[PDB]
Design an enzyme around this catalytic site. Structure first.
Site, PDB file in Angstrom:
ATOM      1  N   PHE A  40      -6.596 -29.581 -14.997  1.00 45.44           N
ATOM      2  CA  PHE A  40      -6.892 -29.805 -13.665  1.00 45.44           C
ATOM      3  C   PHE A  40      -7.649 -28.783 -13.256  1.00 45.44           C
ATOM      4  O   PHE A  40      -7.537 -27.513 -13.328  1.00 45.44           O
ATOM      5  CB  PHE A  40      -5.698 -30.198 -12.836  1.00 45.44           C
ATOM      6  CG  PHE A  40      -5.978 -30.830 -11.532  1.00 45.44           C
ATOM      7  CD1 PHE A  40      -6.053 -31.994 -11.404  1.00 45.44           C
ATOM      8  CD2 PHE A  40      -5.904 -30.033 -10.450  1.00 45.44           C
ATOM      9  CE1 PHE A  40      -6.583 -32.618 -10.224  1.00 45.44           C
ATOM     10  CE2 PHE A  40      -6.052 -30.603  -8.976  1.00 45.44           C
ATOM     11  CZ  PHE A  40      -6.425 -31.990  -8.985  1.00 45.44           C
ATOM     12  N   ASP A  63      -4.992 -26.321  -2.197  1.00 51.53           N
ATOM     13  CA  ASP A  63      -4.085 -27.647  -2.089  1.00 51.53           C
ATOM     14  C   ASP A  63      -4.166 -28.182  -0.654  1.00 51.53           C
ATOM     15  O   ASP A  63      -4.596 -27.333   0.490  1.00 51.53           O
ATOM     16  CB  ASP A  63      -2.400 -26.831  -1.958  1.00 51.53           C
ATOM     17  CG  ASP A  63      -2.166 -26.627  -3.339  1.00 51.53           C
ATOM     18  OD1 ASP A  63      -2.967 -27.022  -4.333  1.00 51.53           O
ATOM     19  OD2 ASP A  63      -0.985 -26.267  -3.917  1.00 51.53           O
ATOM     20  N   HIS A 106      -7.145 -22.222  -7.304  1.00 46.12           N
ATOM     21  CA  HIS A 106      -6.295 -22.141  -8.969  1.00 46.12           C
ATOM     22  C   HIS A 106      -6.410 -23.342  -9.475  1.00 46.12           C
ATOM     23  O   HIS A 106      -7.029 -24.260  -8.881  1.00 46.12           O
ATOM     24  CB  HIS A 106      -4.619 -22.041  -8.280  1.00 46.12           C
ATOM     25  CG  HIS A 106      -4.155 -22.948  -7.458  1.00 46.12           C
ATOM     26  ND1 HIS A 106      -4.380 -23.160  -6.217  1.00 46.12           N
ATOM     27  CD2 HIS A 106      -3.294 -23.970  -7.742  1.00 46.12           C
ATOM     28  CE1 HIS A 106      -3.744 -24.293  -5.633  1.00 46.12           C
ATOM     29  NE2 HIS A 106      -3.118 -24.583  -6.712  1.00 46.12           N
TER      30      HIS A 106
HETATM   31  C1  SCV Z   1       0.862 -28.533  -7.978  1.00 47.49           C
HETATM   32  C2  SCV Z   1       1.150 -28.954  -9.532  1.00 47.49           C
HETATM   33  C3  SCV Z   1       0.406 -27.539 -10.321  1.00 47.49           C
HETATM   34  C4  SCV Z   1       0.432 -29.934 -10.293  1.00 47.49           C
HETATM   35  O1  SCV Z   1      -0.568 -30.502  -9.606  1.00 47.49           O
HETATM   36  C5  SCV Z   1      -0.659 -30.982  -8.509  1.00 47.49           C
HETATM   37  O2  SCV Z   1       0.408 -31.864  -8.049  1.00 47.49           O
HETATM   38  C6  SCV Z   1      -2.008 -31.511  -7.602  1.00 47.49           C
HETATM   39  N1  SCV Z   1      -1.722 -32.141  -6.602  1.00 47.49           N
HETATM   40  C7  SCV Z   1      -2.320 -33.230  -6.347  1.00 47.49           C
HETATM   41  O3  SCV Z   1      -2.792 -34.091  -7.089  1.00 47.49           O
HETATM   42  C8  SCV Z   1      -2.082 -33.830  -4.980  1.00 47.49           C
HETATM   43  C9  SCV Z   1      -0.956 -34.769  -5.036  1.00 47.49           C
HETATM   44  C10 SCV Z   1      -0.489 -35.541  -3.791  1.00 47.49           C
HETATM   45  C11 SCV Z   1       0.425 -36.742  -3.832  1.00 47.49           C
HETATM   46  N2  SCV Z   1       0.213 -37.885  -4.458  1.00 47.49           N
HETATM   47  C12 SCV Z   1       0.796 -37.135  -2.448  1.00 47.49           C
HETATM   48  O4  SCV Z   1       0.363 -38.408  -1.971  1.00 47.49           O
HETATM   49  O5  SCV Z   1       1.260 -36.238  -1.339  1.00 47.49           O
HETATM   50  C13 SCV Z   1      -2.608 -29.939  -7.673  1.00 47.49           C
HETATM   51  O6  SCV Z   1      -2.765 -29.321  -8.736  1.00 47.49           O
HETATM   52  S1  SCV Z   1      -2.247 -29.256  -6.105  1.00 47.49           S
HETATM   53  C14 SCV Z   1       0.256 -30.098 -11.644  1.00 47.49           C
HETATM   54  O7  SCV Z   1      -0.835 -30.449 -11.946  1.00 47.49           O
HETATM   55  O8  SCV Z   1       1.024 -29.086 -12.397  1.00 47.49           O
HETATM   56 FE   FE2 Z   2      -2.462 -26.970  -6.584  1.00 53.14          FE
END
Ligand code: SCV
Ligand code: FE2
EC number: 1.21.3.1
Length: 329
Positions: free
Chosen positions: A209, A214, A268
């Site tokens: 990713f 965030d 990040h």
């Molecule tokens: C944080 C972690 C590292 C993780 O990353 C996530 O969850 C990615 N968040 C989003 O896609 C937002 C998701 C929002 C969710 N659907 C909503 O409706 O509230 C991020 O990288 S922040 C990972 O990949 O390990």
């Molecule tokens: Fe994140």
């Protein structure tokens, strides 16, 4: 090699009690970490993370392809137009490796006033069949309230750190209307690992990713003990060490807005690692109409030249923008 990022371990247990002086010493540590790399590990947090990981593994390894379509968000299943946030996010073998399950406030029931009004970002959670996943829904709903409790304590620490009363953020973070979400993410081990599922950064680093800030007030994350996160600092991207006993905490862009970038939302990214692991974030979101007037802790009068932004406006716009930038997860 990449240098190790400074990510201090902060004992946050005083934030659950009544020793005000002890709480101020924790707030100072939060202030220091927020002004440095923007990340810290919360330790002595009181949550049973081993049980969380065991219950999440039982769910991820037993859910079937049939159930994933039946729980899928609208990006994967056009029959489910009300599911934008909550539900199953499918992998695409040979193309997209990650898969996940997102749920929202368990109080968002069919009779909730925001569900009746069909207000954006509010949805009723979807769950697998109880007979196929015994105890999963009950465990997951209780987990929401356990991590909500830790997040409320952390928000008292951030409020004190910014020179405010301890309920400054927590008074807008309430069980009846929080927009907070839990995401149960599965990163698989794959042999051969699809190159199409691996992204490449400008510096050559293989990623799952890309770089981002965030969409949250703060993010409260449990992950397996497999190193993967990197944070951009003035000295370049640095590796965040793994710690599967603590919660990794960082600020989101709503905190950067409210503090006029005093507490930046750290940039990040997630490195590609060929390992079966879990990533379980709790995005600390306020209520739809929550508005905190922006301020600046580096200015004598504390005034900022930023305009007030409702949390609902921030969230709806932010989630869409992150999908446009880094792709549908
Ligand atoms: C944080 C972690 C590292 C993780 O990353 C996530 O969850 C990615 N968040 C989003 O896609 C937002 C998701 C929002 C969710 N659907 C909503 O409706 O509230 C991020 O990288 S922040 C990972 O990949 O390990
Ligand atoms: Fe994140």
């Amino acid at each position: 090699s990449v240098s190790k990022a400074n990510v201090p371990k902060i004992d946050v247990s005083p934030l659950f009690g009544d020793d005000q002086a002890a709480k101020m010493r924790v707030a100072q540590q939060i202030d220091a970490a927020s002004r440095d790399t923007g990340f810290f590990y919360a330790v002595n947090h009181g949550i049973n993370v081993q049980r969380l990981s065991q219950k999440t593994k039982e769910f991820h390894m037993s859910i079937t392809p049939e159930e994933k379509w039946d729980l899928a968000i609208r990006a994967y299943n056009k029959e489910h137009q009300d599911q934008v946030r909550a539900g199953y996010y499918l992998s695409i073998p040979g193309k997209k490796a990650v898969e996940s399950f997102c749920y929202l406030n368990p109080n968002f029931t069919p009779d909730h006033p925001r569900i009746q009004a069909k207000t954006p970002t509010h949805e009723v959670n979807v769950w697998p069949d109880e007979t196929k996943h015994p105890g999963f829904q009950d465990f997951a709903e209780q987990y929401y309230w356990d991590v909500f409790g830790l997040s409320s304590a952390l928000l008292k620490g951030y409020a004190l750190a910014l020179g405010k009363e301890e309920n400054f953020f927590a008074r807008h973070f309430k069980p009846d209307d929080t927009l907070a979400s839990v995401v149960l993410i599965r990163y698989p081990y794959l042999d051969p690992y699809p190159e199409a599922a691996i992204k490449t950064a400008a510096d050559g680093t293989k990623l799952s990713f890309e770089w981002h800030e965030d969409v949250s007030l703060i993010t409260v994350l449990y992950q397996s003990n497999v190193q993967n996160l990197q944070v951009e600092t003035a000295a370049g991207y640095q590796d965040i060490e793994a710690d599967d006993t603590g919660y990794l905490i960082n600020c989101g862009s709503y905190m950067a807005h409210l503090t006029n970038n005093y507490y930046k939302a750290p940039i990040h990214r997630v490195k590609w690692v060929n390992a079966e692991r879990q990533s379980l974030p709790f995005f600390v979101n306020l209520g739809y109409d929550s508005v905190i007037d922006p301020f600046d802790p580096r200015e004598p009068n504390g005034k900022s030249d930023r305009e007030p932004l409702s949390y609902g406006d921030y969230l709806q716009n932010g989630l869409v923008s992150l999908i446009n930038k880094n792709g549908q997860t």
